[PDB]
Amino acid sequence: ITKDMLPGPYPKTPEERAAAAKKYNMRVEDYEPYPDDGMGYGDYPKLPDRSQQERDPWYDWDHPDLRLNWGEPMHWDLDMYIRNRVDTSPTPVNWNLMCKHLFGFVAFMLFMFWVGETYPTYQPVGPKQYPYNNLYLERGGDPNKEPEPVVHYEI
Amino acid sequence: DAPPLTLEGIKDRVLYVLKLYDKIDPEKLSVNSHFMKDLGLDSLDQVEIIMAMEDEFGFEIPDIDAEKLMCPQEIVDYIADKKDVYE
Amino acid sequence: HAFFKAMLFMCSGSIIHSLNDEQDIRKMGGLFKAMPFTTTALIIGSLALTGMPFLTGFYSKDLIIESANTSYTNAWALLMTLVATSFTAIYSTRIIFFALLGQPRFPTLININENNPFLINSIKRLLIGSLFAGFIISNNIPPMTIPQMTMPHYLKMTALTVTIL
Amino acid sequence: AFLPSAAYLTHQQKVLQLYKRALRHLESRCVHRDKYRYFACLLRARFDEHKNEKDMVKATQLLREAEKEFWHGQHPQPYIFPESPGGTSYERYECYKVPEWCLDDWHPSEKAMYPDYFAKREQWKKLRRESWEREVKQLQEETPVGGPRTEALPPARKQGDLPPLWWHIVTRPRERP
Amino acid sequence: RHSIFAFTHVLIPVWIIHYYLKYHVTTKPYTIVEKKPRIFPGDTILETGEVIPPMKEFPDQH
Amino acid sequence: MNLFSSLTLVTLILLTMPIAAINFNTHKFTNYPLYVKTTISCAFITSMIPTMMFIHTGQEMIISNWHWLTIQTLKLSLSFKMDFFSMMFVPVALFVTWSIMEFSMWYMHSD
Amino acid sequence: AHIEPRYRQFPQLTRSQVIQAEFFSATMWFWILWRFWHDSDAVLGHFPYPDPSQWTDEELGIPPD
Amino acid sequence: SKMELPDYKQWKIEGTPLETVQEKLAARGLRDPWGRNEAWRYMGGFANNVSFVGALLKGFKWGFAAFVVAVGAEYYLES
Amino acid sequence: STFVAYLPDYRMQEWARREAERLVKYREAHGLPLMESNCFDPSKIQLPED
Amino acid sequence: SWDKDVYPEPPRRTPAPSPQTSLPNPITYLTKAFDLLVDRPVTLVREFIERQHAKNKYYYYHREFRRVPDITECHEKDVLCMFEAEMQWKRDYKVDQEIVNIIQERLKACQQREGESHRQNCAKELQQFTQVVKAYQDRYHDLGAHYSARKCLAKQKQRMLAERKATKEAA
Amino acid sequence: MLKYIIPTMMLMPLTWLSKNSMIWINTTLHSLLISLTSLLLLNQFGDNSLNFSLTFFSDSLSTPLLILTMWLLPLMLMASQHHLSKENLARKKLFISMLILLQLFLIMTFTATELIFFYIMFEATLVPTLIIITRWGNQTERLNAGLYFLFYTLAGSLPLLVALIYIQNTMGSLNFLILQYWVQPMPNSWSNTFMWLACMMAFMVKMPLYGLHLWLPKAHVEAPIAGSMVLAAILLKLGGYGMMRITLLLNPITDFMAYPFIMLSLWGMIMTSSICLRQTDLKSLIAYSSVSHMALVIVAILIQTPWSYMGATALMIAHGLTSSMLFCLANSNYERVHSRTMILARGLQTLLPLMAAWWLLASLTNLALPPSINLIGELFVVMSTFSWSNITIILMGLNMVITALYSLYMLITTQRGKHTHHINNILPSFTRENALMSLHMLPLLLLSLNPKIILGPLY
Amino acid sequence: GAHLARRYLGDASVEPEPLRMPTFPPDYGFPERKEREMVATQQEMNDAQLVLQQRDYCAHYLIRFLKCKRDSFPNFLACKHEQHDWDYCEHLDYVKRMKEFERERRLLQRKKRREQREADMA
Amino acid sequence: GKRLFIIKPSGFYDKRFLKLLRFYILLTGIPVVIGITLINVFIGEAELAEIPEGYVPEHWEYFKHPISRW
């Protein structure tokens, strides 16, 4: 390695842009660095921002695990777009329709759960009757305090 | 499990699948018979042949290798190289 | 559920291993006579899952839905539990129809074999479990809660009617 | 437009790949063989109707509308072969594909358990190290000015020599180690 | 050697941990605490011989 | 009392012993999966005995055998709870694991 | 010894597995029929359900006025 | 090691729904050249598969016979 | 590990149990409460006037 | 052995076995097998071990701590007395912690022993646990990680000042 | 404590009068003997601490740190004898003397009964560490790492000394045994505010604190293996020990004062775990994990409850052992592939099975799998901070997930997947490396059996 | 199940609610009503370790069934007659609860009729 | 039956390390556990007794196990 192969400041002159494109091993027309807004990116190229799952899996890749070649410029977020991580594959259904359908499904069933909680179902019976003043001593009540007499009558 | 495949078995299977094709008469084709000139097939017929062998052998041939396969000996050699036969 | 679900996965693994590591149901079929023991055990497990009377699944699921019917519960949850029971029946017979019946769809080289003693013995033991263990456990356990037995006719036959539908 | 040997996909390869993908998705849509055969014959008619179209931009527009038609009605979960990428058995045995050079690090005590195999390995290494300079000189005298244009490698055009860069492709681990 | 597995895998650990429970766990208080056995009417206590009287005569319904 | 706790702890010890067996190997194990399967079957029988003990009598146990850590008011001790749930779950899980390991001995033969 | 694989024909079957499958299916159906014959109450219903509207007025303590 | 294959000439589509497909295509006007390749699935031992209700009723005859025998036996022993 | 395992009554953690085993057996025998709410005796402590 | 008074246990009442059916339960047979194969060898080995113990008998004693003056009779910034008061307070702190542990053991043992009727049959253990927890919270809680005798004395003084204020406002 | 200082000082005539190539053997043997004799410090009483003389005393808090230091020295000599095989004999003896001197200052720091003596040794640990980092490192940035490591710490520690001297003019003494009985409450004022800042910011810097942690990713990834071990496992605990000693004098002003630092650490654990989720370097990942764990220890000390103190010391010991093991793993991988990139060497399980087992075990102990002492310490800190407030558990719980999101990730990218094709210098695992990892892990797994010796001075 | 439709989709002032019953006095309309009698003693129910929900008004059948199940080991299907007796008793209890529900509904309907008559005359 | 060579990394060094680790652990593990068992069986444990009048125990006489006393 040597000094003039490491990344540097943002290129301004077209000659510096061509030198940076030759350093990063691609065409000058395809070399688009990050905009110099002062975020610290520098002269690193702005790759088309897609995951490694969208690459060709049948190609003889140098690194078939990551689907990457040798000497090709890596993405700034290559650790995010590996196959172990976030995928940007084209879905058969549009994103907005999927999100709206899922939110409507969840919201509708939550609303119907609340409505059913408002109006419960039961069976036409009275309360269950337990003996000995509704089991006052068996519910952990103190034996000194005599409970209020609850009497259940035959029906 | 997974019985081994020999070159004779692969050639017999590819000749069987090609013989069960109505566009190819069985009395003229050979193992070194080209699809386009010797048998007068079509590109769509070549795709049908490739997917027939794919469904026969239970593994998928990529398109970049499927477009260059035009003769049964080439198919035998490709399947032999992929399945690592004759060890 | 542990009993019949373990045995169902065992049958599915036997079918997968007999079809050269294929886990897709769209490339199956015709295995009713190719693997008879796996067919029998899969049918028994699906019947026990759906709520076949007096199997393992009857002695737990039917009591569960009877207690859920005649209780002070949410109506919407009960309705969705009934719909989910119907859907369990639906996908169980979907597995039975696609994986086991119809016409063959696997590749031509047939290497179907299940006659090893280990697989046969394990499926046999889990089959005996999925036939009798629910009855044995339900007759052996002591009571802890009062079971519900006074229910109207339309609520008693609800699970069987929904499974049949 | 990502190919190992070529730089682009022509019209014919695009039509053939679209036909193959459409037939595979149609096979995934209808489970049974007879229904798939009927609809595959129907699709073959649909593709054969517009075969002899000499207008190039009309062929391009037919390709675009056929691609939109395929994207509109493809299966959400198409059938994938087990060894194909995205399959259930894809790259499963990569945990057993031990590279060959690990055999160079074996102890001499365990190297004596397979004498003849290691003798043949030594012969293979001698062949590779005696053909390496010849094949790199073949490569350096055949590559044009400005580097190679494509990734296609030249064969062995002489008698007694081997094709260049043959080691890591011949000695790759098997699919079932 | 047909009963090696029935001896070195069951009997020896049973001996070891029965010794451990009898002379080192039950020695310390409140280590092994057991639910009391169920007492039903009509039973007889083994400890002191008392008999639990039977229940009141049932008002039969069937 | 001296049979319930003894049989359940010897079930636990019998199940944990083949890990110590495989951790102290020098040669290649001769039919190690068969050894594990036999161990699990024996442990299933040894667990099935206190299950019918609980079915007959209704005995529940708490085995606080090893005093591990007293931190001010809190005391953490190795305590095992034998009740309805443990006694009706352990033989079922052991039977399922026995069948699963026989099936895996068939299925995972080539690995 | 073992079962030789066959190409695009019906596979070779073992008599023992066919006998075992038929025996286990017969055992399942016999168990179901036997339990439905003997128990017969867990399916159709354990107890009759009286009509709440059929109860008479004087046994419910309804004061007539 | 050596797997011999059966004769190719027996694979005809007769008696199979592939002739129904052939009749539909011939009424429309096309050909189905791949019928003979898939003719093996519909003929031989894989033909005439059972229905779903016949699949659920596997072994019902012997089970019914055993149930009748056991009921008669318990009726004899209860007397 | 053998030396650490056989440490002679680390931080008297056993001893504080055993003395407690005595002490409860004192105050349960004579009807005293198990623990008083005041750590020190209220008779020997002076409060500021308020 | 342990102390039956500080670790109480209610009298045990096991009902006699009165079987109804003629089928022999396997529990009695396995109990006989356990008593023959297992109990006798373990008993013999333990008897041999105790016989070997009986030849050489030596004693260990419980350490006795005499009473030293507490922090209420220590002068300000005189280390030679507040030191001893601090260590006595630490020993009393550990003894109190183990007392609460003993009461917790009693409560858990009662709850597990009395079974499904544990809510009624263990009221006394629950009330003793509540009393000892109230005493421990009023004596030692909220002192901090750097607790000492002076912090506990200050907390107690604040508690009696609040109690005096409350009983003055009610009279 | 004179029975441990004298053999440590005599280690230097051992390493300077040894043979041409017998320095490593003799130093390892005699340092292991010192580590064996270090177990006599376990004579702890439930009320009284072990007081040796007017200068040295050992409580139940300093004892585990002393045992860990004297155990770490032979492991350090074993770790740092592979990349120094090409070194000069005089430079090798100088390196061993530097390690011996650093260990001597460390074991004299923890036993100091005087806060001035403790502070003097606490700054005397700076010089050998800085010399090791700036001399025996590998990259260029070590020179920059020699500045951020230094001028941070002194910037926290030079005001603090003044505050300590103020105590010498106020309470009359700085002896810790005296100050436990002569302590006074601290009223709320600006003077006591800035005295609290002076007495605490040195220990926030050396722990480190989020915001002031910038020296730690720089001084961990340029330093050699011995320097990485000494920063990760011991030198980050000087701040915790100083906090635990100095919190006694700063009451009750700490109740409303600890709020911004508690919020800083409670957000810094999430920030550093998220940073660990995206780090491209193994060494930087281990450094940021150390920052997160020490922020947790900062929260535990600042809330000052007994459970928090217990969890703090358990977390300190467990994190020291685990971080030392992880750094030795990273050093072995760096020595085998000659780079620090995580994504470079993948699929090492197919080549090193035993190193894969060690990696799995170290990652298991990193995410605090029970019943390891990592889970004991982290659990007790969680209980104490739930007692402090009922919402902080959320700020704990999410953090736990992110821990399990990177440690296993640190496993997977280094162990699983298809191996790289162009790397063919992967040697089999040496006996020395495996001995190092077993000596790192077996005490950590054994301490789960008897954790009562690492549960602080109020157990 | 029709009572849910009568209460929700109809009028809730006539249909009784399950949360609070009874609202009518038990001595209204019933000349000299009789109280239910407990057979199982509190001590017998206490030392049998019955579950608190299992301690209904005829737990003596449950005690007898548990004793028979304990004393007929290992024949677990020997004495299902006690189980049938317990099931019949709890069915009778459910019938009594249904009778109480119907009584409350009819009394509420009578009260509505009474106020409707008061509205008619006034 | 056409046996194919299985390529694997050299496990000789890891096996050697594990064998050496087991040997060097057991070399002092076995005598320590043998001595501990012989002490527990023959020497045995102490007994709790009240302190007699006129006698004060030694500082090592308050512990139960012989190893703890030593």
Ligand SMILES: CCCCCCCCCCCCCCCCCC(=O)OC[C@H](COP(=O)([O-])OCC[N+](C)(C)C)OC(=O)CCCCCCCCCCCCCCCCC
């Ligand atoms: C296969 C060969 C087996 C061995 C053969 C030879 C020996 C034969 C049998 C005799 C053994 C010796 C006599 C009996 C045992 C000694 C009795 C005794 O008092 O022992 C001292 C103690 C008993 O406890 P203790 O109450 O005496 O000690 C308390 C000590 N203080 C007060 C300081 C806290 O230890 C044992 O008995 C050992 C128990 C081993 C089983 C548990 C192992 C756990 C491993 C994982 C650790 C982490 C757990 C995390 C979870 C914790 C819970 C939440």
Ligand SMILES: CCCCCCCCCCCCCCCCCC(=O)OC[C@H](COP(=O)([O-])OCC[N+](C)(C)C)OC(=O)CCCCCCCCCCCCCCCCC
């Ligand atoms: C401390 C700070 C510095 C840290 C680094 C230190 C470096 C130097 C290290 C020096 C040596 C190690 C010192 C610490 C030793 C800790 C261990 C110790 O002695 O503990 C004392 C404890 C003491 O137990 P105890 O306290 O309960 O007993 C009372 C005390 N005695 C022993 C006197 C009666 O030892 C044990 O608990 C040992 C129990 C027996 C052995 C283990 C039996 C079970 C084993 C596992 C069985 C299978 C389980 C399931 C497995 C499933 C698969 C995974």
Ligand SMILES: *C(=O)CCCCCCCCCCCCC
């Ligand atoms: C009376 O009609 C109320 C019955 C209980 C609430 C409704 C339950 C609905 C689901 C069970 C019956 C399903 C019949 C197909």
